[PDB]
Amino acid sequence: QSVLTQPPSVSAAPGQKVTISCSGSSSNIGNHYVSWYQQLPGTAPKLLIYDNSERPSGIPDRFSGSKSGTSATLGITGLQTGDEADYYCGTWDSSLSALVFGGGTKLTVLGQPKAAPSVTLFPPSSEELQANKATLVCLISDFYPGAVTVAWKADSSPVKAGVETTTPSKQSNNKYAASSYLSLTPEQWKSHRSYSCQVTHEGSTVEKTVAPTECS
Amino acid sequence: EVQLLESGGGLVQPGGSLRLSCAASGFTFSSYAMSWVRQAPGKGLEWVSAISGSGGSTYYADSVKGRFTISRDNSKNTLYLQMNSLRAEDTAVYYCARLRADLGLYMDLWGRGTLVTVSSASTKGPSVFPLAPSSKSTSGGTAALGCLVKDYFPEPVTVSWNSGALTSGVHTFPAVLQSSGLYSLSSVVTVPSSSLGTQTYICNVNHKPSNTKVDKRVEPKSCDKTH
Ligand SMILES: [Cl-]
Ligand SMILES: [Cl-]
Ligand SMILES: [Cl-]
Ligand SMILES: [Cl-]
Ligand SMILES: [Cl-]
């Protein structure tokens, strides 16, 4: 995925402080200046921090950056709901000859209780199998904060091909849901003993498993 | 004040070509290196290409070398990205960004983005498959059941349940763009397991672009002993 490593998710209540780390190597953060980009939901990224620790006009001093060795850190004090966003670190990498980014961190400003996800896994319907297709549908519901990681397993081996996953969005009850799809051929579906949808939320992984030969 | 505005985004087939522009205003365009950055829907930022103030120097991400060509016209304050041999993986919002280099390299000014969708698809109504309630859910309490609305183009579809008589516990998800070049979404509802013998559950899927409406009955599976 991305060259720089960021935590997927950080959260704290309004008025608290958080830090978001960015881990790299000599050829990127080690030898070059780190910038930070803020992406508010449904907007283009914007420059937050440049030259490791400098603020553009209009960025308040609640926002700070530092770099040491092959790591960088963004600090946010006096957290407020308007800070809720995806944050990306960036730098130059002299070894890839490329501007590189971290994978992004979703910052949640906590406004409701934390809730571990419910995970509902549907095997391919008889009807879809008879149309010669096979989709596993992993429905992930009633969680907060709105940030998950989804991994699919065929028996015990990871599957990366045929995977599509939606960005969490709010349910009527104000908690988050998200969906993930694993697209197989009927041949692939029938030729494994089981498939699993693994969801990682905060300090929990919840995994559901279905089997071609079992009534799910 | 300084601004960037991308255009040229839209639908193009695998193997096809598309050209994006960006118009700059409020500064001396020729004084600044320029950058394209993309973001597949719900994924991270990915740098694509950069170009020196003059044009005489160009840079590319490995993934786009020999397919994309960045260029600019300083007389028209315009940046271009010509994309050729497009692939499904090139599907993304493309942002133009001003690249500063005074001390470190960073992108201080961004456009609003333009979406590029790479699919061979044309108008196609959905297939609707049942997401039958788990046989382990149906013994008591509640059960999740749904509809998988698959293989349609373009967006959107709207989903109701029992012709709008059932709204509590309903969640319709955003669409994904599959490797097929077609959209899929799901709608789910939680219902009393006791009702499953005797209440009918029908998703109602409307795809106005193909004038298709599909009503799909969702029932317990044959293999489920409860039914
Ligand atoms: Cl990267
Ligand atoms: Cl669960
Ligand atoms: Cl089954
Ligand atoms: Cl200027
Ligand atoms: Cl500059």
Author numbering:
A (entry chain LLL): 2 to 27, 27A, 27B, 28 to 95, 95A, 95B, 96 to 213
B (entry chain HHH): 1 to 52, 52A, 53 to 82, 82A, 82B, 82C, 83 to 100, 100A, ...
What does the paper say about this structure?
C0020187 is a human monoclonal antibody specific for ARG2 that was derived from phage-display selections on naïve libraries of scFvs based on human Ig variable regions. We wanted to improve the affinity and potency of C0020187 to enhance its efficacy in vivo. The parental antibody, C0020187, showed inhibition to human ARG2 with an IC50 of ∼890 nM, with an inhibition curve that lies to the left of the small-molecule inhibitor NHLA (NG-hydroxy-ʟ-arginine [Millipore]).
While attempting to measure the affinity of the parental antibody, it was observed that the sensorgrams of C0020187 did not fit well to the classic 1:1 binding model, exhibiting multiphasic binding interactions and less satisfactory fits than its affinity-matured progeny. Moreover, the binding signals of the parental antibody were approximately two- to threefold lower than the affinity-matured antibodies. These observations coincided with several notable characteristics of the behavior of the parental antibody that are suggestive of negativity cooperativity on binding to trimeric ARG2. Interestingly, Fab C0020187 appeared to bind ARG2 as a tight 1:3 complex in solution, equivalent to one Fab molecule per trimer, whereas the optimized Fabs C0021158, C0021177, and C0021181 formed tight 3:3 complexes with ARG2 as would be expected if all three sites were equivalent. Taken together, these observations suggest significant negative cooperativity for the parental antibody’s interaction with trimeric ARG2, an issue that appears to have been resolved through the antibody optimization process. While this model is not able to accurately model the nonidealized three-site binding of Fab to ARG2, it should give us a reasonable measure of the initial high-affinity binding site, which would be the dominant interaction captured in the concentration range used in the BLI experiments. This analysis produced a much better fit than the 1:1 binding model, suggesting a KD value of ∼10 nM for the initial high-affinity binding site, and a substantially weaker binding interaction, which is tentatively estimated to be in the low micromolar range for the low-affinity binding sites. Even though the central hydrophobic cleft exhibits the same conformation in the parent Fab C0020187 and the affinity-matured Fabs (C0021158 and C0021181), the parent antibody does not induce the single-turn hydrophobic helix in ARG2, which is seen to fill the hydrophobic cleft between the VH and VL of the complexed affinity-matured Fabs.
